[PDB]
């Protein structure tokens, strides 16, 4: 389930 | 489901 | 469904 | 439906 | 319907 | 209807 | 109607 | 009507 | 009317 | 009227 | 009137 | 009047 | 008047 | 007047 | 006057 | 005057 | 004068 | 004078 | 003078 | 289970 | 089990 | 009437 | 009348 | 009537 | 009148 | 009058 | 009627 | 009727 | 009927 | 029927 | 039927 | 049937 | 059947 | 069957 | 089968 | 089988 | 098998 | 096997 | 084996 | 072996 | 061996 | 050996 | 009756 | 009956 | 019966 | 029967 | 039977 | 039988 | 048999 | 057999 | 056998 | 054998 | 053998 | 052997 | 050998 | 040898 | 040798 | 040698 | 030598 | 020499 | 020399 | 020289 | 010189 | 025996 | 034996 | 032997 | 021997 | 020997 | 010496 | 010597 | 030797 | 010397 | 030697 | 000298 | 000098 | 030597 | 001088 | 001077 | 001067 | 030498 | 001046 | 002036 | 002026 | 003025 | 004005 | 105005 | 206005 | 307006 | 409006 | 509005 | 609203 | 609301 | 609420 | 020398 | 020298 | 010198 | 000099 | 000088 | 000077 | 001057 | 001036 | 001026 | 001015 | 002004 | 003003 949050981090960093 | 967010990141980075 | 966003990225990058 | 956007990309790149 | 845009691309590239 | 544009391309390329 | 443009192309190429 | 242009092409090529 | 141009072509080729 | 040009061609070829 | 030119051709060929 | 030229052809061929 | 030339042809052929 | 030439032909053939 | 030549032909043939 | 030549022919044939 | 030649013919034929 | 030749013919025929 | 020849003919025929 | 919190930290730091 | 608290510390420090 | 011309020919030949 | 010309021929031949 | 012309020919040839 | 010419011929032949 | 010429012939033959 | 023209030809050739 | 034209040709050639 | 036109050609060529 | 047109061609060429 | 059109071509070319 | 169209082409080119 | 279309092309090009 | 489409192309290009 | 699609491409490009 | 897809690409690009 | 996917990419990019 | 995944990436990026 | 994971990363980033 | 873990990190960060 | 643990740290931090 | 423990500390702090 | 005409001839000659 | 005409000829010649 | 006509000829010539 | 016509010719020529 | 026609020709020419 | 037609020609020409 | 047709031609030309 | 057709041609041309 | 067809051509052209 | 087809062409063109 | 096909082409074009 | 195929092309194009 | 394939191309394009 | 493959390409494209 | 591979590419793309 | 690999890339991309 | 590795990268990325 | 390692990095990242 | 180590770091991180 | 050690740190941390 | 030791500390802590 | 007919002639003339 | 016919002629002429 | 026929002619003409 | 036929002609003409 | 046929012609024409 | 033959003629006539 | 034959003629006549 | 055939022609034409 | 042959002709005629 | 064939032609045409 | 042949003709005719 | 040949013609005809 | 063939043609055409 | 050849023609014809 | 060749033609024809 | 060549053509034809 | 083939053509066309 | 070449063409054809 | 070249073409063709 | 080059083309073609 | 170049193209092609 | 360059292209192509 | 450059492209290509 | 630059691109490419 | 820059990109690329 | 900057990026990249 | 800055980042990066 | 600052961070980083 | 300050921290760091 | 101060600490640190 | 082949063509076409 | 090949083409096309 | 190759092309295409 | 290669291309394409 | 290479490309592509 | 390299690229790509 | 390097890139990529 | 380095990058990446 | 260094970075990273 | 150092950092990190 | 030092730190850390 | 010293600390710690 941590995969979801990891992916979310990639979004949140590149914004 | 993380695939959706990963793809979203590619959009958000190249904008 | 991620296919739609992937395709969208190709548009958004080449603009 | 992604086909439409893919095609659109070919237009937008060659302009 | 993507056929229309594909064809359009051939016009737009050879101009 | 794409036939019209295809034909148009042949004109536009050979000009 | 594309016939007209096709024919036109034969003129325009051989000029 | 394309017949007219076709014929015209035969003239224009043999000139 | 294309007959006129066709005939004209025979003249123009044999000159 | 194309008859005139056809005949003319016979002259012009045999000269 | 094409008769005149036709006849003329017979002269011009046998010369 | 073409009769004159026709006759002339008979002369010109048998010479 | 073509009679004159016709007659002339008979002379010219039998010479 | 063609009579003269016709007669002349009879001479010229029998010589 | 053609009579003279006609007569002449009778001489020339029987010689 | 053709009488002279006609008569002459009678001589020339019976010789 | 043709009388002389006519008479001459009678001699020449009966010889 | 043709009388002489006529008479001569009577001699020449009866010989 | 033709009388002489005429007379001569009477001799020559009755011989 | 600590993986979840570790991932959460990456989100919370890059915000 | 201390791993959970260690991870928790990383969250709590970067907030 | 052809009799007249036939007779005439016998004259015109024996002259 | 052909009799007249026939007779005339007998004269014109025996002269 | 051809008889008349035939006869005429015999005259016109023997002249 | 042909009698006169016939008689005349008998003279003109026997001369 | 033919009698006169006939008689004349009898003289002209017997001379 | 061709007889008439045939006869006419015999005249028109022997002239 | 071709006979008439054939005959006519014999005239029209020998003129 | 082709006979008629064939014959016609013989006229129209020898004129 | 092609015979008719063939014949017609012989006329139309020799004119 | 191609015979008809072939024949037609011979006419239409020699005009 | 291609024969028909081939023949047709010979017409349509020589016009 | 390709023969039919090939033939058709020869027409459609020479028009 | 590719023959059919190839032939079709020759038509569709020369129009 | 790729032959079919290749051929199809030649059509679809020249339209 | 890659041949099929390669061919397909040539179609899908030239449309 | 990578050939198949590579080919697939050429399709999926040119659409 | 890395070839397979590399190829897969080219697809998954160009979609 | 690190090659496999490296390749995997290229997929997992471009999704 | 550190190569394996390094590679693993690139995956685990880009997810 | 410290390399192994250093690498391990990069994993354990980016999770 | 202190290197090993130093490295270990980096792990044990970032957990 | 021929006797009568024969006798008549003796008169008509000796006159 | 030919006797009658033969006799008649003797009269008609000696006149 | 030819005798009758032969005899008739002797009359018709000596007239 | 040709004898009759032959005889007839002698009459018809000497007229 | 050709004799009959040959004879007939002698009549038909001497008329 | 050609003799018959040959003879016929002599008639048909001399008419 | 060609003799028959050859002869026939002589008739058919001289008409 | 070509002789027959050759002969036939002479007829068919002179008609 | 080509002789037969060649001959046939002479017929088929002169018709 | 090409001679046969060549000859055939002369027929098939002149029709 | 190419001669055969070349000849065949002349037929197949002139049809 | 390329000659054979070249020749074949001339056939296959003119059809 | 490339000649063979080049020739083959001319066939395969004109079909 | 590249010539062979180049030629091969011309075939493989025009199919 | 790069020429070989370059050529190979032209094949592998146009398929 | 880099030329070889560069060329290789063109193949490996267009597959 | 870096050129070699750079080139190698182009291969290794496009696979 | 840093160029070599930089290049090496491009390989090692794109794998 | 720090350039060398900096470059080395780029390798050692992207592995 | 501190540059060297700073660079060294970047290596020693990213391992 | 404190710079050297400060830098050294960064190494000695991150190990 | 001819003596009888000779004598008979003397009677038949003097009647 | 011809003497008999000769004598017979003297009778048959003087009748 | 021809003497017999010669004599016969004198009879057959004077009848 | 031709003498016989020559003599025969004199009979056959004067009939 | 031709003398025989020449003489024969005189018979065969005057019949 | 011709006198002998002339005399001979009188005999051969009056027989 | 002709005197003998002349005398002989008188006998052979008066018989 | 051609004399024989020449003479033969005079027969074969006048028949 | 022609006198001898002329005289001979009278004999060969009156026979 | 051509004289023989020339003469032969005169026969073969007038038949 | 032609006189001799002319005289000879009279003999060779009246035979 | 042509007189000799003309005379010769009369002989070679009347034979 | 071409004279022989030329002459031969005159035969082979008039047959 | 052409007179000689003209005369020669009459001989070479009437032979 | 062409007169000489024209005359020559008559000879070379009538041979 | 073309007259000379025209005349020459008649010879070179009728040979 | 081409004269031979030229002449040969006249034969081979008129057959 | 083209007249000379036109005339020359007739020669070079009819040869 | 193009007339000269046109004429030249006829020569260079019919050769 | 293009007329000159057009004419030139006919020469340079028919050569 | 493009007419000149168009014409030039025909030359430079047909060469 | 583009017409000039279009025409120029045809030359520069067909060269 | 882009027409000029488009045309220019055709030249600069086909060179 | 982008049309101008698009066209320019084709030139700057095909150079 | 971005169209202008997009077009500009194609130029600045293909250069 | 970001479209303008996106486009600008493509230029500033491909330069 | 962050879209503008995101786009700006791409420029400021790729520079 | 933090989105604006996040975006700003990317700019202020990549500068 | 702490999100704003967290974001702010990233800016104030990467500056 | 301590979250706000914790976040504030990160700012006030990284400044 | 091209004359030989030119002539050869006239044969090979008219066969 | 190109003349030889040009001529050769006329042969090789008309076969 | 290009003329040679141009001509060669005309051969190599029409084969 | 490019003319040589241009021409060479026409050969190498039409093979 | 680029013209040489441009031309060279046309060869190297059509092979 | 870049023109040279641009052209060179067209070669190096189409090989 | 960057144009040179840009062009160079097109070469160095397509190799 | 940065343009030079930007362009240089395109080279140095595609090698 | 930072533009220069930014560009420089793109080089120094892609090496 | 901090922009310069920021940019400098991007260089100094990617080396 | 602290911005300068902040930026400086990014350099001094990444060295 | 403490901001300056805070920033200074970040430098002085990371050295």
Residue numbers in the entry:
A (entry chain XA), B (entry chain PA), C (entry chain HA), D (entry chain 9), E (entry chain 1), F (entry chain t), ...: 101 to 115
V (entry chain N), W (entry chain P), X (entry chain L), Y (entry chain R), Z (entry chain T), AA (entry chain J), ...: 1 to 15
AQ (entry chain mA), AR (entry chain eA), AS (entry chain WA), AT (entry chain OA), AU (entry chain GA), AV (entry chain 8), ...: 401 to 415
BL (entry chain lA), BM (entry chain dA), BN (entry chain VA), BO (entry chain NA), BP (entry chain FA), BS (entry chain 7), ...: 301 to 315
BQ (entry chain cA), BR (entry chain kA), BT (entry chain UA), BV (entry chain MA), BW (entry chain EA), BY (entry chain 6), ...: 201 to 215
Study authors write:
Therefore, the designed series of Form I-like peptides encompassed minimal peptide sequences in which the structurally determinative distance between the RxxxR motif and the C-terminus was systematically varied over the range from 2 to 5 heptad repeats. Three filaments, derived from peptides 15-10-3, 29-24-3, and 36-31-3, were selected for further analysis using cryo-EM imaging with direct electron detection. Five protofilaments interacted to form the 15-10-3 filament, four interacted in the 29-24-3 filament, and three interacted in the 36-31-3 filament. In each case, the α-helical protomers within a protofilament stacked along a right-handed n-start helix, in which the value of n corresponded to the number of protofilaments within a nanotube. For example, each 5-start helix of 15-10-3 passed through every fifth protomer and therefore corresponded to the axial stacking direction in a protofilament. For the 29-24-3 peptide, the interaction occurred between the C-terminus of peptide (ia) and the RxxxR motif of peptide (ib + 1), in contrast to the C5-symmetric structure of 15-10-3 that involved helices ia and ib. Despite the differences in cross-sectional geometry for the respective filaments, the helix crossing angles were remarkably similar and lay within the range from 95° to 105°.
